[PDB]
Amino acid sequence: DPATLAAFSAAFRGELIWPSDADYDEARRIWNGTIDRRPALIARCTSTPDVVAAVSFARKSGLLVAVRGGGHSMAGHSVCDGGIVIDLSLMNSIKVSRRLRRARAQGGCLLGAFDTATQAHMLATPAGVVSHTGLGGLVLGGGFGWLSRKYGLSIDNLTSVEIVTADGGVLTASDTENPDLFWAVRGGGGNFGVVTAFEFDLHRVGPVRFASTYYSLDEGPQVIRAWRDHMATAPDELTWALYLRLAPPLPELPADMHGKPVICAMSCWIGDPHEGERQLESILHAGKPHGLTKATLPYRALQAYSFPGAVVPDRIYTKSGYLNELSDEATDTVLEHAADIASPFTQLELLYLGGAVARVPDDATAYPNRQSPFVTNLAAAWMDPTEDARHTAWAREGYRALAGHLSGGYVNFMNPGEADRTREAYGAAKFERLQGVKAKYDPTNLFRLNQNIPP
Numbered sequence: 001d002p003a004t005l006a007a008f009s010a011a012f013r014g015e016l017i018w019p020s021d022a023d024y025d026e027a028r029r030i031w032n033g034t035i036d037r038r039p040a041l042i043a044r045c046t047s048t049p050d051v052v053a054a055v056s057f058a059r060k061s062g063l064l065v066a067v068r069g070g071g072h073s074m075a076g077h078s079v080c081d082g083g084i085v086i087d088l089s090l091m092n093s094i095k096v097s098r099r100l101r102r103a104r105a106q107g108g109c110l111l112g113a114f115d116t117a118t119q120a121h122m123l124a125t126p127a128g129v130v131s132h133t134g135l136g137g138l139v140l141g142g143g144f145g146w147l148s149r150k151y152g153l154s155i156d157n158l159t160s161v162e163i164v165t166a167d168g169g170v171l172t173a174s175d176t177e178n179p180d181l182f183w184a185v186r187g188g189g190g191n192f193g194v195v196t197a198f199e200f201d202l203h204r205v206g207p208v209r210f211a212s213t214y215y216s217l218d219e220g221p222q223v224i225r226a227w228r229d230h231m232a233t234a235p236d237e238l239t240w241a242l243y244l245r246l247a248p249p250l251p252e253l254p255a256d257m258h259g260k261p262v263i264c265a266m267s268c269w270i271g272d273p274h275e276g277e278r279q280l281e282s283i284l285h286a287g288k289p290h291g292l293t294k295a296t297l298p299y300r301a302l303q304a305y306s307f308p309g310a311v312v313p314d315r316i317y318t319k320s321g322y323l324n325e326l327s328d329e330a331t332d333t334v335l336e337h338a339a340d341i342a343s344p345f346t347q348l349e350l351l352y353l354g355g356a357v358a359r360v361p362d363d364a365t366a367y368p369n370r371q372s373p374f375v376t377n378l379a380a381a382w383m384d385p386t387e388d389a390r391h392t393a394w395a396r397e398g399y400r401a402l403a404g405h406l407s408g409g410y411v412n413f414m415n416p417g418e419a420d421r422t423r424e425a426y427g428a429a430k431f432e433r434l435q436g437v438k439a440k441y442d443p444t445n446l447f448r449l450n451q452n453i454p455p
């Protein structure tokens with residue numbers, strides 16, 4: 001409708017992307033290549049008022065609203081067929097202060113712009129481990145990475161935000177301003193509106209001692225048992241994750257391990273590197289290590305490596321849950337399952353959290369499952385679309401195969417088929433509180449391309 005559209009055009013100064021344009025096919029592609037959808041309109045916003053006009057417009061037109069930060073939605077939420085995509089990719093600007101250890105990021109930041117900005121002052125705050133992830137979706141659902149055991153979730157360092165709500169108002173939210181929303185936005189998702197600015201606290205982070213190695217799959221049981229019990233008792237400073245995968249063809253690996261299923265191990269000591277050297281060495285021989293790399297890295301460097309691969313995978317499928325305890329039978333399963341991995345980029349990942357995260361009260365934020373120390377992520381990944389059924393199937397026979405030991409799911413790991421699963425991840429009780437807040441700030445469920453919260 002022209003009256004509605006012309007008003008939008010006048011107030012908006014960000015590039016427009018229409019269904020026809022030469023850049024349409026690229027603008028609508030997201031990282032998750034299995035989602036192939038065609039929106040009515042793509043708005044690459046370049047400022048806060050840009051976003052406001054776009055929020056109202058979609059509402060007055062009855063356009064379904066998709067919000068996209070870095071496009072990594074494993075569930076494919078940041079693109080739609082037949083509606084509007086609010087792309088904040090252009091809002092990528094960042095303010096720092098050495099003298100205030102504070103940063104202000106627009107809602108479309110990629111991690112690597114952010115980490116770059118803070119490490120300019122030898123500063124950092126926890127975020128994910130792969131740098132081109134969008135800051136937006138990551139934080140909205142919670143957000144962890146290397147510093148999380150020491151310093152908590154990204155949301156655990158979040159102070160204020162600027163957010164555009166469905167009714168087109170602009171609000172600041174913090175612990176003292178609309179704390180109901182600030183509570184809800186720390187973990188609920190984009191259900192409540194579009195974050196245009198984020199406020200954090202910053203910590204000083206110098207060179208960190210880091211190690212990755214490749215243990216033979218024969219030694220899988222003892223390493224994980226060692227891994228799980230030791231991490232039960234590991235310093236907050238120690239972070240140690242496991243990636244089970246086909247062995248990369250690296251010259252550091254013996255040819256007889258190339259292309260064979262191995263266990264990788266990535267670890268680091270957030271702290272003095274001298275203490276680190278001692279501590280990592282003590283756990284590196286949980287089994288016989290191969291393709292051993294040790295370095296002292298600026299934290300920026302810790303984020304960049306994730307992850308070495310010569311091909312970027314087009315098609316992905318993920319299945320994730322939490323565990324309170326990993327039994328021996330659980331250990332045998334995953335180990336049992338691994339041998340079946342048949343594509344070079346799919347990983348069954350095993351992360352151990354707790355630390356600063358578990359010392360935070362379960363109801364203190366919208367992030368549920370703090371008390372669950374374990375995360376497992378079954379990440380099918382491949383290229384050839386026709387092969388979809390073979391890999392896609394594997395991860396389920398896995399969550400499904402391993403689906404008891406589990407209690408929940410991380411919202412930022414839901415795949416495109418898990419929209420109904422929104423209730424077990426958050427748990428019941430929390431969700432009732434969330435629905436009250438959504439009903440106050442988004443009574444109409446305008447924002448439904450997320451792990452959706454009905455009003």
Ligand SMILES: Cc1cc2nc3c(=O)[nH]c(=O)nc-3n(C[C@H](O)[C@H](O)[C@H](O)COP(=O)(O)OP(=O)(O)OC[C@H]3O[C@@H](n4cnc5c(N)ncnc54)[C@H](O)[C@@H]3O)c2cc1C
Nearest residue numbers: 069070073078107128129134136137138143144190195450
């Ligand atoms: C390869 C990979 C690695 C990852 N590693 C980690 C990790 O180490 N730690 C971790 O915690 N998570 C991790 N994640 C999860 C990550 O949070 C999700 O991929 C998430 O979808 C990425 O956010 P995004 O804004 O880039 O994606 P989007 O799809 O654009 O965002 C996902 C959801 O958030 C909404 N949203 C996004 N930005 C905004 C905004 N500014 N305002 C309002 N709503 C918004 C979207 O509409 C959608 O509802 C990883 C994901 C991938 C794919």
Ligand SMILES: [Xe]
Nearest residue numbers: 095097102104
């Ligand atoms: Xe700031």
Ligand SMILES: [Xe]
Nearest residue numbers: 318347379381
């Ligand atoms: Xe992944």
